[PDB]
Amino acid sequence: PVVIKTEGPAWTPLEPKLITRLADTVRTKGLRSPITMAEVEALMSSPLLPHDVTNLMRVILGPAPYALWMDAWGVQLQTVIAAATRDPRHPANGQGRGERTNLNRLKGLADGMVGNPQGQAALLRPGELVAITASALQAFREVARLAPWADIMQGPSESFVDFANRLIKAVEGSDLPPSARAPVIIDCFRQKSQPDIQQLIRTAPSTLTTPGEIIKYVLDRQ
Amino acid sequence: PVVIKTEGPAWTPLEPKLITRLADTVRTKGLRSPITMAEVEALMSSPLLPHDVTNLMRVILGPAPYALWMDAWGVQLQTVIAAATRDPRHPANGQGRGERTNLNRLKGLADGMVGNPQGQAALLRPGELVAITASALQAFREVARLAPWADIMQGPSESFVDFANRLIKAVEGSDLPPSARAPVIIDCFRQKSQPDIQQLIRTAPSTLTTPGEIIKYVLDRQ
Amino acid sequence: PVVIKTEGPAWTPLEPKLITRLADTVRTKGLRSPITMAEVEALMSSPLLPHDVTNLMRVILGPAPYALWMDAWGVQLQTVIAAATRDPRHPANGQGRGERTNLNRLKGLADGMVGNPQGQAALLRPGELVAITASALQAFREVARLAPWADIMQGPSESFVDFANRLIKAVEGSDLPPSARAPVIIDCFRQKSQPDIQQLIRTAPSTLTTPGEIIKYVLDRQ
Amino acid sequence: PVVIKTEGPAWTPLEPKLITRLADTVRTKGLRSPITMAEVEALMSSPLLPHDVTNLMRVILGPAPYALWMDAWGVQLQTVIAAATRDPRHPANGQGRGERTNLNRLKGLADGMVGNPQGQAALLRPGELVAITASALQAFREVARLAPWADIMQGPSESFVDFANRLIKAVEGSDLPPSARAPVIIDCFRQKSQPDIQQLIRTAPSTLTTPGEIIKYVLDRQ
Amino acid sequence: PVVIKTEGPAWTPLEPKLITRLADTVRTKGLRSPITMAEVEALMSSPLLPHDVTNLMRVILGPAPYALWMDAWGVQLQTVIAAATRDPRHPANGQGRGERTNLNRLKGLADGMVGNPQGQAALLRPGELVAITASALQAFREVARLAPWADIMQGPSESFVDFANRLIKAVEGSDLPPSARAPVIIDCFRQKSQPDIQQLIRTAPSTLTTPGEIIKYVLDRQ
Amino acid sequence: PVVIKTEGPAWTPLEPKLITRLADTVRTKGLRSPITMAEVEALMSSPLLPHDVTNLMRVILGPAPYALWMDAWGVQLQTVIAAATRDPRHPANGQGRGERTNLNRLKGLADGMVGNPQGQAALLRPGELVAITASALQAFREVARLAPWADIMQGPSESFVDFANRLIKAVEGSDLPPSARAPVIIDCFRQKSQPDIQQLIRTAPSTLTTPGEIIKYVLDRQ
């Protein structure tokens, strides 16, 4: 992370203990655990430098997952670059004519950044760290994604709430665009729930358009 | 949370460890545990940004409970908006003519806030964070509520204090308006306690109008 | 708690972890445990706001004990009000003519304090927080008191020191005014201890007037 | 403890957790444990106010031990008062004519100190806190002392080092004036050690006058 | 580590607890554990002085491993010296004519540095600490390396991902120059994987040139 | 330890918890454990006052070991005094004519230092604390030393690395002057290792003069 000191931007390493701690969480709970995800997001709540993210991931992830994270990160950074190239006002760009970002800077490979977190802190702009961090985080999620919702049905002894949570987690972790998730989830609620639930949802008000709204409606009738 | 730095308002993430810790508390103790409630309230003792609350809840709550929290939060925020719309002096509103709050700001979706906790800290007013935080907390309580007081009776081997606590917890977690809770609780004490207790309470002074007052009176006579 | 910042008095929440921790202590050790008492006193060593004390107690205490604490606190606050009303120079009062304290302020219910720890910090005076805190603490002790010294006698296989500690704890936790405790304890030492101890104490110097003095005298003769 | 803030001396409570922690140490390890002693000394390394010491001891000690501590503390404070009365330049005294210390101040009972750690911090001088703290600590040691060295002999299967440590601990915890301890310990080494050790020590250089010097000499010959 | 204070650069020791903690990690998990490596890297994220690194390594490593670390460090420092000697603009050199670094300074043996972390902090330049730290870290990796990839083949019941991670770890820990690792790893994927995987990789696009790219391609087809 | 505050040098006690922690380490792991040594060195990384060192050692060491530490410390301090007496420019001496150090100051017994860590902090010079600390540390090592390398031979089922580490630890903990350790260790490698190792070392390059160099050479041939 970076903190503004008297002379200027300075590098401050992530606490070694939290890194080790997360490494354990990843190992004990798995990449797809809400605990892990929450902890990783927490550690990445403060803008990180390339040096921070690569060493963080290298440590908490296995050799293979780290290799996957690196490819995912590269792709994510490239999408940032494509956007920053198309829009001069992109926050990753500097205000000045010669301040557009590039892939070398985002990876901390540009002149004066190579293997130097202090130089990265001194040269990268706040907007670049935001992109670097969000990119690294998304890359982590992709790795966790790659670490079927359409076959999920409410079991005869399974409660609605358990089926709803199971189904929602599968859809949110799927390849669907986010905008398709709510309609897809509600369709599965209407079609794949047990007979009594299917009748509750059938006659629900037509204004209930989110999964949470439908869940409340059903739970209120149990 | 937000801290006022030299240049102005800045975002400071909630400690990752406390978030993970609460996630465990929720998982091990349950949503309706006084331990959980106490810990959540503690973590939400400092005004939070939309970014803080959504990521906090997404992490400590399961997919389903989080979907419920989101719907509850939306409702709570809307009640804030309704109040801020009716009263220009509402603390969530800015002093200036074009400073009334709106749902987009409270959700951190307004221009310059989207997915940016730093921008949220720079743009949201203290009063808006208070509303955002209180709203998020109430939404959490609602989720815990949805995670019967009228059938509770003092068992033949059950102590009064245990029946009183059991009954009070059921009434406080019920759908009654808060103003009805004390009269309802005292009525149940008078009618549903064991015969000896019913006689103690029968002749209690008419000035004892709270559950705590009646409990003391009974305990003093044991 | 309150800390004086640049702009003025500001609210700082009690650490969520210590609150949870105390909740555990109360649950595992009990209200009448010296461990609990010590920990509660420690947490209440810094002046607290109404918001701090009510949420602290609501969390660490069960529904019933909390209802009892609330009644006890009300009584304690009223005694403060009675004193502040009788003596204009009472520390809970402000120096100015219109600065006497009242029950609404002490409960954080006065204009601008309702459900707002920041406003409470900005409006309550240091002396009011002292009273609020001492009152809350005393209320806690009362609850622990209500959660017999006259029948305590030294058992035939019980050591004097154990009987002395047992007896002293019972007398200190009793309804006696504090000024009666030392004479009552020493009387019990003289009358209810085993025959050999009764003879040691019989001929003790007449200048030994505290329980600790008599204990030392006896222990010195063992 | 006291910290000098902008407006002046201010009270800062001892960390509740360390107090609870020590209470456990006292309970689990005992008063005469080097662990306890070390921890207590550590907690009392920073000058404490009357409020700090009494509440610290009340919490970590049982009712009886606390009553003993209070008597011991009173005696210790009186010795400080006797010294400060005889020597105007005593550090517990203020530089000014009307600044001699007295027992009421040291106990935090003087005008403006009663039950008020903030007032104690504002009124007590640094030298008074030093005396209050050293006195409280000595009182703790006395309590631990009261919680035989002359019969200790080296057992036939006991090593010299173990006998030496056993003996030294008994002599240091005894009623001997500190100046008598070294000669007494060395006499016991010469007379009460096993035959082979008695011969080693017999012909030791006459310049070895401390227990540590004699121990080294013996260990060097094993 | 070094922190810039008012008077200038000052030495601040690494937290004793993290050092002890890492010592345990090394002992319990081993030198070649990603946990250890991550923790060591974390502790060495802040520029260290010779005093910091030697005492850190002496403590966390056994006598033999420490002797190996010392030889490795010497070699690493010499490579730094060779580079700083060939390039006057090397960051380890001072801007002034008489400010080139030398082995004595890097080892903290130069005039005023010997056994004095405060003097080292006052005399060594930021660039020298960077070199000292990176050198110490590389020396640690070498020790871990010395604490076969060509025989690794995917087992008949072994998953591709497990074989890929196993193989990648062996190649990264090998004597190959880093530039040879990716081609060597991909060759092993093509030749030493199970028959079905060999067919997947055979017809992969010719643009997939990293191990991570090939892994993704295969995983996408499982 | 000492920290420079506004008014000047001030005493800050070592954290009670780390002291207790080390006491446990000493008790559980022993004085000759690399864990203990590392932890003690860590705690003594910041210049300590006489008050700090004596109370630190008194707490973490048993009565006997502490008595030994005190004698060792006295000897170490005297060597410092001998050096500071012979060289006026010795860092333990003040720049002024009447600023040479003496044993009373180093032990914190000089006027104004007796039993007063605050006075010690105000009167002792930085160089004196360095000497006091290094002396205390060396005294600790001596105690650990006194808490045979010539008979060590590589066992028939013992690996070279294990024999090398065993031997090196024995030689480093011996009475040899440090300058004799490397030649003595290498001689033992050549003469007391198993036959195959003896042949590896026999024909080693004549430039390999440290134990680490020879170890690497052997390990490279295994």
Swiss-Prot record, chains A, B, C, D, E, F:
<protein>
    <recommendedName>
        <fullName>Capsid protein p27, alternate cleaved 1</fullName>
    </recommendedName>
</protein>
<feature type="region of interest" description="Involved in capsid protein dimerization">
    <location>
        <begin position="51"/>
        <end position="59"/>
    </location>
</feature>
<comment type="subunit">
    <text>Homodimer. Homomultimer. Homohexamer.</text>
</comment>
<feature type="region of interest" description="Involved in capsid protein dimerization">
    <location>
        <begin position="112"/>
        <end position="123"/>
    </location>
</feature>
<feature type="site" description="Involved in capsid protein dimerization upon acidification">
    <location>
        <position position="187"/>
    </location>
</feature>
<feature type="site" description="Involved in capsid protein dimerization upon acidification">
    <location>
        <position position="175"/>
    </location>
</feature>
